[PDB]
Amino acid sequence: SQIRQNYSTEVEAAVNRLVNLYLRASYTYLSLGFYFDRDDVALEGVCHFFRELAEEKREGAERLLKMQNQRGGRALFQDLQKPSQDEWGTTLDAMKAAIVLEKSLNQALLDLHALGSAQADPHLCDFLESHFLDEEVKLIKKMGDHLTNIQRLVGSQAGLGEYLFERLTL
Amino acid sequence: SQIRQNYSTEVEAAVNRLVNLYLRASYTYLSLGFYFDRDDVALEGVCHFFRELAEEKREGAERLLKMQNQRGGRALFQDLQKPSQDEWGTTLDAMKAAIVLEKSLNQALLDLHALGSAQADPHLCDFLESHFLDEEVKLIKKMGDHLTNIQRLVGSQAGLGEYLFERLTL
Amino acid sequence: SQIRQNYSTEVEAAVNRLVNLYLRASYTYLSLGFYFDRDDVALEGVCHFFRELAEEKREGAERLLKMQNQRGGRALFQDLQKPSQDEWGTTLDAMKAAIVLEKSLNQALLDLHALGSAQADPHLCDFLESHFLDEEVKLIKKMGDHLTNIQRLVGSQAGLGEYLFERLTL
Amino acid sequence: SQIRQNYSTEVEAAVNRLVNLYLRASYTYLSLGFYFDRDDVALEGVCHFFRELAEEKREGAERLLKMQNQRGGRALFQDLQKPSQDEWGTTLDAMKAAIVLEKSLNQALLDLHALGSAQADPHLCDFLESHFLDEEVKLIKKMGDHLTNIQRLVGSQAGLGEYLFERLTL
């Protein structure tokens, strides 16, 4: 490329894999959102929480794709595997699955940042720090906060607790 | 009639029967609304939910009556039978009865649309699709959503659950 | 389902397949958009044309998913295959590929409408007519218009023609 | 200095050299701008593109000079050599020369960031990442985009192509 400078093929490849992961997470949250919109689940606040995360993860993939082009790399798309589950259980189950998902994205982000350090790519490192690392940390704290509240609520009367959490937090 | 064109006597008759059904549903919801306004029931949000449906069903009957005249048919009114019950039980009982009612209206609408297809009456078909079919589908989804939430809430402590549903959803 | 009425399992299945197709088309347009944003392609108007179609196709999938839930069907997600190409050639090549894509979506929409007629599902039929059929027809006309103009322009001096089309039409 | 802390003499020296480079680039763009303003060149959009970069590079030098003082270093100015050329040829020639210039600035910025890492100077590293590294990457992408378009345009009829690029892009 005429513009490419200090952009290793290893980082280029890893950015394409991260795109696939972010698109995969978007798809998982789309499936999460529409499950809670089922007439036999019917937790609209939980649906809306996950649909907004579907959008967030899609926008993350697009910002990686733009950075890829900005550095003279070449985007390469692969098959997107379907979400891990067809039905997501309770609000508690879904929130647990969401924290697992976000922790894996965060580990991919930390792995890529480590690669950029090993490759001495400060623009990549700054890019991840500015638009992804602190975003993940906040989101994981929020979900941790939610988990603790769901758990406190679904101790003895789970149906009541799930209703109140959706009504009064989400 | 000077204006009548492609309007079968079968469809004319079926529109008059549908009017009677819609007026009957309005009357059922009027009785539902005022029951929840009783001082020994006292669920104002449930009263208001059903009174708004009383109005909706009356407006549906009036839009059928107007279409009847628009096609050169002749409205014919019959006795309106009283609602099926004098007392409607819990919010759960009432919502179950409401979904039964709406499913019967929806089946009358689908039956009439099928007749209009058999009679090749595209204006009638479009009229039902535009102002009734998707309205019913949305309303039945909403009531299904409500049923699921009432059920989740009235598991172990029904009095508390009925209060919270009226307070926080309706 | 408590709400399901006149919704065949055949239509439910076909709506899930249509969702997968619409998501697949969104992915194809995402890949189209970012190719024209490459520093060695650099046709920003073409990038923006395809990125807006990526969004449109995603919103179509979401409106099918919502209708699925509205009828008491159950969304089922499958793997999303990657776009057919990694590099998309000229603006002309890409527009040709886009018309092929849209014609296949349109045929899926016509096939599903035909199924809804065979199943006597007027709500499904009206839903497709209201939110998809005329949208596709307009989009395919526009792309046909674009193809004709690209072709007129890239007769003798293709590089100049591709620049002017991006500058003065897109 | 009373305020100096964790600011190596190596980084101080390298910041002064970077200032000289940024001032040299400003001077190069001033010469580029006024060439395209010649009555026998007369490409006003190209003149304006380069004059704005003259200002940008001067502001970069001033932000380095301010950071130098902020850390307790001492600015040291050297002779500023004249631009490499007196006449800059076509828009294509000039854009090629500009990308070479920016890539050398970018390499100076990456070299200095590497030094700050070797010296464990996180304030310097963050300063370069925040105000220079991503600015360079965007500018080099834009110029790469421009080069590709100039090249597409100046294939067969170069005079026409240079006019249209100045008119419709710049």
Side-chain angles (χ1 to χ4, degrees), chain A residues 1-155 157-170, chain B residues 1-155 157-170, chain C residues 1-155 157-170, chain D residues 1-155 157-170:
Chain A
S1 146
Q2 279 270 276
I3 72 165
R4 195 180 185 142
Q5 185 167 214
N6 197 40
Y7 197 60
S8 69
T9 55
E10 287 86 8
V11 161
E12 179 183 9
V15 168
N16 283 323
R17 286 195 292 279
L18 196 63
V19 167
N20 185 266
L21 290 187
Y22 264 75
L23 291 172
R24 281 170 53 193
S26 190
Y27 201 16
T28 293
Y29 285 133
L30 183 70
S31 175
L32 274 159
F34 276 102
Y35 168 82
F36 282 99
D37 179 59
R38 287 174 38 167
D39 78 277
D40 61 351
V41 179
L43 289 164
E44 191 191 330
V46 183
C47 179
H48 179 86
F49 178 78
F50 286 127
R51 277 185 83 190
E52 202 263 350
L53 291 174
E55 168 182 15
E56 280 316 287
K57 295 312 186 211
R58 180 211 339 109
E59 289 160 8
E62 289 176 14
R63 165 145 37 221
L64 287 161
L65 288 166
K66 166 194 212 148
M67 179 281 284
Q68 179 83 287
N69 272 345
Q70 276 194 315
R71 298 290 303 272
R74 291 304 172 240
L76 280 200
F77 295 99
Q78 312 276 345
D79 291 340
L80 285 174
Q81 72 193 259
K82 72 185 198 174
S84 66
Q85 298 173 218
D86 295 323
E87 313 201 319
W88 298 94
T90 63
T91 300
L92 182 51
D93 291 327
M95 206 63 69
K96 272 172 192 179
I99 285 158
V100 168
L101 180 48
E102 295 304 323
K103 281 173 129 209
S104 70
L105 287 180
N106 196 38
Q107 193 57 62
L109 286 162
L110 295 175
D111 291 349
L112 178 61
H113 189 284
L115 177 58
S117 206
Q119 293 283 333
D121 189 347
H123 174 276
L124 172 74
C125 285
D126 177 64
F127 169 83
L128 292 180
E129 289 158 25
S130 295
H131 306 118
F132 289 94
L133 292 184
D134 189 51
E135 178 182 62
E136 279 313 307
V137 159
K138 296 172 211 180
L139 180 54
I140 297 173
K141 174 64 166 57
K142 167 142 42 174
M143 298 177 152
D145 289 345
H146 290 343
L147 266 190
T148 293
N149 274 287
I150 295 168
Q151 279 169 332
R152 180 151 50 217
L153 276 164
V154 302
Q157 280 175 325
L160 175 72
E162 196 161 13
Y163 177 73
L164 287 168
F165 185 79
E166 183 266 343
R167 287 284 98 184
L168 299 180
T169 298
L170 293 170
Chain B
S1 146
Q2 279 270 276
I3 72 165
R4 195 180 185 142
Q5 185 167 214
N6 197 40
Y7 197 60
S8 69
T9 55
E10 287 86 8
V11 161
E12 179 183 9
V15 168
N16 283 323
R17 286 195 292 279
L18 196 63
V19 167
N20 185 266
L21 290 187
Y22 264 75
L23 291 172
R24 281 170 53 193
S26 190
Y27 201 16
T28 293
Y29 285 133
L30 183 70
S31 175
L32 274 159
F34 276 102
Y35 168 82
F36 282 99
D37 179 59
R38 287 174 38 167
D39 78 277
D40 61 351
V41 179
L43 289 164
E44 191 191 330
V46 183
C47 179
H48 179 86
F49 178 78
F50 286 127
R51 277 185 83 190
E52 202 263 350
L53 291 174
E55 168 182 15
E56 280 316 287
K57 295 312 186 211
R58 180 211 339 109
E59 289 160 8
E62 289 176 14
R63 165 145 37 221
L64 287 161
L65 288 166
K66 166 194 212 148
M67 179 281 284
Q68 179 83 287
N69 272 345
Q70 276 194 315
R71 298 290 303 272
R74 291 304 172 240
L76 280 200
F77 295 99
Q78 312 276 345
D79 291 340
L80 285 174
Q81 72 193 259
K82 72 185 198 174
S84 66
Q85 298 173 218
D86 295 323
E87 313 201 319
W88 298 94
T90 63
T91 300
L92 182 51
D93 291 327
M95 206 63 69
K96 272 172 192 179
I99 285 158
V100 168
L101 180 48
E102 295 304 323
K103 281 173 129 209
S104 70
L105 287 180
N106 196 38
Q107 193 57 62
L109 286 162
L110 295 175
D111 291 349
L112 178 61
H113 189 284
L115 177 58
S117 206
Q119 293 283 333
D121 189 347
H123 174 276
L124 172 74
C125 285
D126 177 64
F127 169 83
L128 292 180
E129 289 158 25
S130 295
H131 306 118
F132 289 94
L133 292 184
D134 189 51
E135 178 182 62
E136 279 313 307
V137 159
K138 296 172 211 180
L139 180 54
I140 297 173
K141 174 64 166 57
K142 167 142 42 174
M143 298 177 152
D145 289 345
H146 290 343
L147 266 190
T148 293
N149 274 287
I150 295 168
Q151 279 169 332
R152 180 151 50 217
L153 276 164
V154 302
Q157 280 175 325
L160 175 72
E162 196 161 13
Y163 177 73
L164 287 168
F165 185 79
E166 183 266 343
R167 287 284 98 184
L168 299 180
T169 298
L170 293 170
Chain C
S1 146
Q2 279 270 276
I3 72 165
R4 195 180 185 142
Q5 185 167 214
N6 197 40
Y7 197 60
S8 69
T9 55
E10 287 86 8
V11 161
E12 179 183 9
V15 168
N16 283 323
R17 286 195 292 279
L18 196 63
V19 167
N20 185 266
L21 290 187
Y22 264 75
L23 291 172
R24 281 170 53 193
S26 190
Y27 201 16
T28 293
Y29 285 133
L30 183 70
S31 175
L32 274 159
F34 276 102
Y35 168 82
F36 282 99
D37 179 59
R38 287 174 38 167
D39 78 277
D40 61 351
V41 179
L43 289 164
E44 191 191 330
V46 183
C47 179
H48 179 86
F49 178 78
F50 286 127
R51 277 185 83 190
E52 202 263 350
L53 291 174
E55 168 182 15
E56 280 316 287
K57 295 312 186 211
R58 180 211 339 109
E59 289 160 8
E62 289 176 14
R63 165 145 37 221
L64 287 161
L65 288 166
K66 166 194 212 148
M67 179 281 284
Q68 179 83 287
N69 272 345
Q70 276 194 315
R71 298 290 303 272
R74 291 304 172 240
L76 280 200
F77 295 99
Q78 312 276 345
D79 291 340
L80 285 174
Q81 72 193 259
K82 72 185 198 174
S84 66
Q85 298 173 218
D86 295 323
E87 313 201 319
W88 298 94
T90 63
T91 300
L92 182 51
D93 291 327
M95 206 63 69
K96 272 172 192 179
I99 285 158
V100 168
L101 180 48
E102 295 304 323
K103 281 173 129 209
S104 70
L105 287 180
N106 196 38
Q107 193 57 62
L109 286 162
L110 295 175
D111 291 349
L112 178 61
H113 189 284
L115 177 58
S117 206
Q119 293 283 333
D121 189 347
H123 174 276
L124 172 74
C125 285
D126 177 64
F127 169 83
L128 292 180
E129 289 158 25
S130 295
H131 306 118
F132 289 94
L133 292 184
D134 189 51
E135 178 182 62
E136 279 313 307
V137 159
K138 296 172 211 180
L139 180 54
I140 297 173
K141 174 64 166 57
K142 167 142 42 174
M143 298 177 152
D145 289 345
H146 290 343
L147 266 190
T148 293
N149 274 287
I150 295 168
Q151 279 169 332
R152 180 151 50 217
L153 276 164
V154 302
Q157 280 175 325
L160 175 72
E162 196 161 13
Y163 177 73
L164 287 168
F165 185 79
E166 183 266 343
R167 287 284 98 184
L168 299 180
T169 298
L170 293 170
Chain D
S1 146
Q2 279 270 276
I3 72 165
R4 195 180 185 142
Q5 185 167 214
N6 197 40
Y7 197 60
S8 69
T9 55
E10 287 86 8
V11 161
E12 179 183 9
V15 168
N16 283 323
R17 286 195 292 279
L18 196 63
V19 167
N20 185 266
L21 290 187
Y22 264 75
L23 291 172
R24 281 170 53 193
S26 190
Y27 201 16
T28 293
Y29 285 133
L30 183 70
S31 175
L32 274 159
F34 276 102
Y35 168 82
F36 282 99
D37 179 59
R38 287 174 38 167
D39 78 277
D40 61 351
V41 179
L43 289 164
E44 191 191 330
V46 183
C47 179
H48 179 86
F49 178 78
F50 286 127
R51 277 185 83 190
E52 202 263 350
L53 291 174
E55 168 182 15
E56 280 316 287
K57 295 312 186 211
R58 180 211 339 109
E59 289 160 8
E62 289 176 14
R63 165 145 37 221
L64 287 161
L65 288 166
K66 166 194 212 148
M67 179 281 284
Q68 179 83 287
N69 272 345
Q70 276 194 315
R71 298 290 303 272
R74 291 304 172 240
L76 280 200
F77 295 99
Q78 312 276 345
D79 291 340
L80 285 174
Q81 72 193 259
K82 72 185 198 174
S84 66
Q85 298 173 218
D86 295 323
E87 313 201 319
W88 298 94
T90 63
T91 300
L92 182 51
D93 291 327
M95 206 63 69
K96 272 172 192 179
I99 285 158
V100 168
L101 180 48
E102 295 304 323
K103 281 173 129 209
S104 70
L105 287 180
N106 196 38
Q107 193 57 62
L109 286 162
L110 295 175
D111 291 349
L112 178 61
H113 189 284
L115 177 58
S117 206
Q119 293 283 333
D121 189 347
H123 174 276
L124 172 74
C125 285
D126 177 64
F127 169 83
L128 292 180
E129 289 158 25
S130 295
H131 306 118
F132 289 94
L133 292 184
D134 189 51
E135 178 182 62
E136 279 313 307
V137 159
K138 296 172 211 180
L139 180 54
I140 297 173
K141 174 64 166 57
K142 167 142 42 174
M143 298 177 152
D145 289 345
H146 290 343
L147 266 190
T148 293
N149 274 287
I150 295 168
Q151 279 169 332
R152 180 151 50 217
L153 276 164
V154 302
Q157 280 175 325
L160 175 72
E162 196 161 13
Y163 177 73
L164 287 168
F165 185 79
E166 183 266 343
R167 287 284 98 184
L168 299 180
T169 298
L170 293 170

